[PDB]
């Protein structure tokens, strides 16, 4: 006697129009499906766009969604909201599907869709035989990449000049680039946000380091979504990573609907989907798959008696939450990002990415990185 | 207060006429606005008449 | 474990001033304050005087305050107590002891000697005799609270006639340091209890329960323990 | 009237048995002024945000005026957001962080600048920085950035992620060259085991200069590092020779009221001094509130913490201003907070030990920097 409507939660972040559009499109495609096996129920999303005021607003949104009787919450977080959201989700046995930056400490009731970027970066830095370079980073997504880079430098004798560019402006960017060129530093690894990376690239073109002889490695999961036009003409060496393969039947099947969508009804559809939107779509597919698997397991999901206040004096975890988390960690689906499968820590396992390089004609696929096969070149 | 009840009150005769219940509506900061403050039910008028915006 | 040396016990003239040499060997009185306790023969101990570690202000016995004056030097680590109009009952065994609050090893009283010129508790059984290697339990009932300021505020001292007393169990959480005695306080301990297992010939002494919860620290009647053959 | 007779103060302590709790109780018992502080202490896991926010909301609904507790890297942002939203002051002796509000008073002074000045004084250019992950990475960023400007060679080693074999390989690489330079930035309760690891399997002597980045130099057992040629340089915030700290410790020693836990001795920690001075700044701030006849008493019971139109109480800004405009001499010295709620205008006693004893080589200030002596 599975319920015909299953309530899910959605927590969204500032500047999340396109990912919310992908979430709504996936909800549309699941709910109005011609096949009766793909949609044996109906997903009811309780959506909160908070424009976060940190943990206070996150806790308020989580309590508002928890009182409605949601089974799983599809939420995003930043550096100021990951800990409270993960602790609230783990304490109350509510699953959290997040396409945000991956973490390590949270190991209960958290499913992260974004794969880690440390292994591919280390394999690329050791296949390129880099021993003295400059790492421009920011702390908006954790310290895992910086820690891994410093550990590899200590274990291999590299010379990494680590610079945090969180509070850097355009003038300071130009001064830093000129100072680094004065020290004959031409090898760079950039791990920043999308806007910060675009500003860094604009400053690099402004000072004129996009000419041949300069090498840049972009620590981003989307390489074709970055406007790299002057670097093609200048001849600078640019190497990047891509998570979603645009020459995949599922991805082009989605793209057929994406170009047919209405901008005034589905905002953010005027541009091709980023990797975050693809991860959101894959997360909705994962939720549908695990709800169908729970239906096949004869588990009557319900939150009739657990609906109430989050901060009660006795902690009242959901009884069937551990069943939901066990079913969520056992999924193995095919989607926009390829093979979606999770380990017992709720992290991405068995994923394949494509390592691209910038040539005179554009981005050229050079190799592919797999979790167990490391870097394989073509 | 603390109910999904719409009340009509006269500002001239100072008496009560109708106290109806909004069917399937949230109350007590259940479905408020972004600013909150127990704004779960919003009553307005337009050229066509009287309208109520709430959530279900 | 600090060392305390006390020697020179002998009779004096009628009303003559007497002094006892208490030397703190291996340590100094600045780390742990030295306090002198007077015990009569066949009676509980009484606090003769409490001093300070920095040698700023010293106290005296609550019974006879102005009758006895004790002067101590922390740098020299030497304490001397004097009195006037000494009587037959005033010639009791006076022993110096370092402060037990600093550490378990710091609870090392002096040798003590006798001359011929509070806390209320009852320990049972009074007459105890068991063979070597046996387990012995003694219950010390008290009229005060079993624990002051949360933790226990009672202790057990294993004293012998003519020998330096030693504190085996203190506050039911820190046993005697250096030589870990098998008997220590445990549990809620409404009555002070210490399960000695296994027993030994060297572990045969008079165990007296003194409660620091009730001001001042005065030794009770205690329970006598021996080695049955 | 000017102030309520009894003022409720919340407390979030990691455990019941600690030296910090004993310092809290003794500092509360010392005060005899008419403004009395009633403590409400809850034992709460500091690594869980759910339990910590439940305790915070319970204490806020009870009606506390200020909260004295500890946090971690997980609960710092939550506490900062809740204090900035509800205008409730939080006084802490934990590690300072850059991401904070004006309602969080961090009693522990920063050390990320004195360490750089000490390294610059010793003319270090190639060294190994052994740091702790769960202590804040701001000092590691500062070290790396200063290395980037000054062309240093820093080998960053994490304590958690390095096993014994990795430490052995790192130290063999250190003895490959002549000048072995190590900067350790880690807490005392783990630095004891770290130094035991260094002295047990690894070795030192004739070189191996260590710079220990901590606020307490007498808080660790350096006898294992003694009787060798290794040089250890650290920072000292409190020393028990000056008149006020000696008087406070003497009153603590000869206390008529017995303290809790087991002992209050055997290398007392600087966090107890920070707790003592936190109670003291709370007391002086509330007495200054009573002196100026500014009404602080609550006009109505506080509601739920999760009210969406959360308006701040009007006395919160006055409480924060009184807590911030404080200048007294305590255990750790001069206690004074700037406009950002962190400690400023203070001093550290730079102490070196080179197989002879303890020698003070100078002091570091926020204005005169490292002045040798
Ligand atoms: C205080 O709260 C923290 C949460 O921030 C608690 O840490 C958490 O402890 C649980 C176990 O009690 C950990 O779950 C286990 O994790 C291991 C992997 O380390 C996994 O193999 C097990 O199957 C299980 O899931 C949890 O990971 C951990 N969270 C962390 C470290 O972020 C801590 O235990 C609490 N302390 C007390 C005294 O309650
Ligand atoms: C990694 O993913 C691949 C799929 O891309 C897995 O290969 C599948 O393995 C199952 C058996 O468990 C077969 O039924 C499928 O036909 C395989 N698909 C293929 C070959 O395309 C592979 O098992 C995964 N590895 C791990 C360790 O999970
Ligand atoms: C650690 O301290 C010792 C003691 O000062 C230093 O040894 C001195 O080294 C200099 C130059 O090498 C000599 O001129 C002195 O005679 C040495 N003094 C003694 C007492 O031997 C040692 O160099 C220091 N270690 C480091 C790494 O700076
Ligand atoms: C930094 O702290 C010191 C130490 O308290 C302050 O020095 C005191 O200043 C006041 C007023 O100027 C004097 O009355 C005290 O006698 C000083 N004490 C000592 C020990 O010198 C100093 O003023 C503080 N600096 C700032 C900018 O607040
Ligand atoms: C719809 O898709 C499901 C899953 O592939 C399949 O089992 C079912 O037969 C399909 N129904 C129709 C009518 O094609
Ligand atoms: C630029 O990239 C090409 C292709 O990988 C490589 O052969 C060349 O050595 C690179 N040059 C520099 C300066 O990195
Ligand atoms: C200890 O404090 C006293 C205060 O009078 C000071 O003179 C002395 O230099 C301090 N010692 C150290 C090592 O800082």
PDB file of N, CA and C in Angstrom, chain C residues 2 12 14 42 54 59 71 87 97 109 147 168 180 213:
ATOM      1  N   UNK C   2      56.881  13.032  48.083  1.00  0.00           N
ATOM      2  CA  UNK C   2      57.738  13.832  48.949  1.00  0.00           C
ATOM      3  C   UNK C   2      58.083  13.049  50.212  1.00  0.00           C
ATOM      4  N   UNK C  12      59.692  16.889  78.358  1.00  0.00           N
ATOM      5  CA  UNK C  12      60.215  18.206  78.679  1.00  0.00           C
ATOM      6  C   UNK C  12      59.868  18.528  80.130  1.00  0.00           C
ATOM      7  N   UNK C  14      58.169  20.991  83.286  1.00  0.00           N
ATOM      8  CA  UNK C  14      56.802  21.493  83.474  1.00  0.00           C
ATOM      9  C   UNK C  14      56.635  22.915  82.960  1.00  0.00           C
ATOM     10  N   UNK C  42      45.374   6.577  71.730  1.00  0.00           N
ATOM     11  CA  UNK C  42      44.061   5.954  71.735  1.00  0.00           C
ATOM     12  C   UNK C  42      42.921   6.918  71.482  1.00  0.00           C
ATOM     13  N   UNK C  54      52.899  29.912  50.559  1.00  0.00           N
ATOM     14  CA  UNK C  54      53.746  31.069  50.301  1.00  0.00           C
ATOM     15  C   UNK C  54      54.248  31.736  51.574  1.00  0.00           C
ATOM     16  N   UNK C  59      47.488  29.537  60.326  1.00  0.00           N
ATOM     17  CA  UNK C  59      46.370  29.331  61.233  1.00  0.00           C
ATOM     18  C   UNK C  59      46.822  28.499  62.429  1.00  0.00           C
ATOM     19  N   UNK C  71      55.530  28.116  63.175  1.00  0.00           N
ATOM     20  CA  UNK C  71      56.224  28.909  62.171  1.00  0.00           C
ATOM     21  C   UNK C  71      56.878  27.975  61.166  1.00  0.00           C
ATOM     22  N   UNK C  87      50.783  20.646  79.668  1.00  0.00           N
ATOM     23  CA  UNK C  87      50.269  19.742  80.685  1.00  0.00           C
ATOM     24  C   UNK C  87      50.488  18.297  80.251  1.00  0.00           C
ATOM     25  N   UNK C  97      52.241  16.998  57.791  1.00  0.00           N
ATOM     26  CA  UNK C  97      51.800  16.373  56.554  1.00  0.00           C
ATOM     27  C   UNK C  97      51.683  17.423  55.461  1.00  0.00           C
ATOM     28  N   UNK C 109      52.367  11.907  55.256  1.00  0.00           N
ATOM     29  CA  UNK C 109      52.546  12.512  56.563  1.00  0.00           C
ATOM     30  C   UNK C 109      53.919  12.160  57.134  1.00  0.00           C
ATOM     31  N   UNK C 147      28.956  13.073  49.935  1.00  0.00           N
ATOM     32  CA  UNK C 147      29.766  13.750  48.932  1.00  0.00           C
ATOM     33  C   UNK C 147      29.514  15.247  49.014  1.00  0.00           C
ATOM     34  N   UNK C 168      45.394   5.876  52.104  1.00  0.00           N
ATOM     35  CA  UNK C 168      45.236   4.908  51.025  1.00  0.00           C
ATOM     36  C   UNK C 168      44.198   5.355  50.002  1.00  0.00           C
ATOM     37  N   UNK C 180      50.227   1.427  45.040  1.00  0.00           N
ATOM     38  CA  UNK C 180      48.770   1.423  44.846  1.00  0.00           C
ATOM     39  C   UNK C 180      48.101   0.372  45.718  1.00  0.00           C
ATOM     40  N   UNK C 213      34.432  16.630  54.252  1.00  0.00           N
ATOM     41  CA  UNK C 213      33.207  17.377  53.985  1.00  0.00           C
ATOM     42  C   UNK C 213      32.797  18.220  55.186  1.00  0.00           C
TER      43      UNK C 213
END
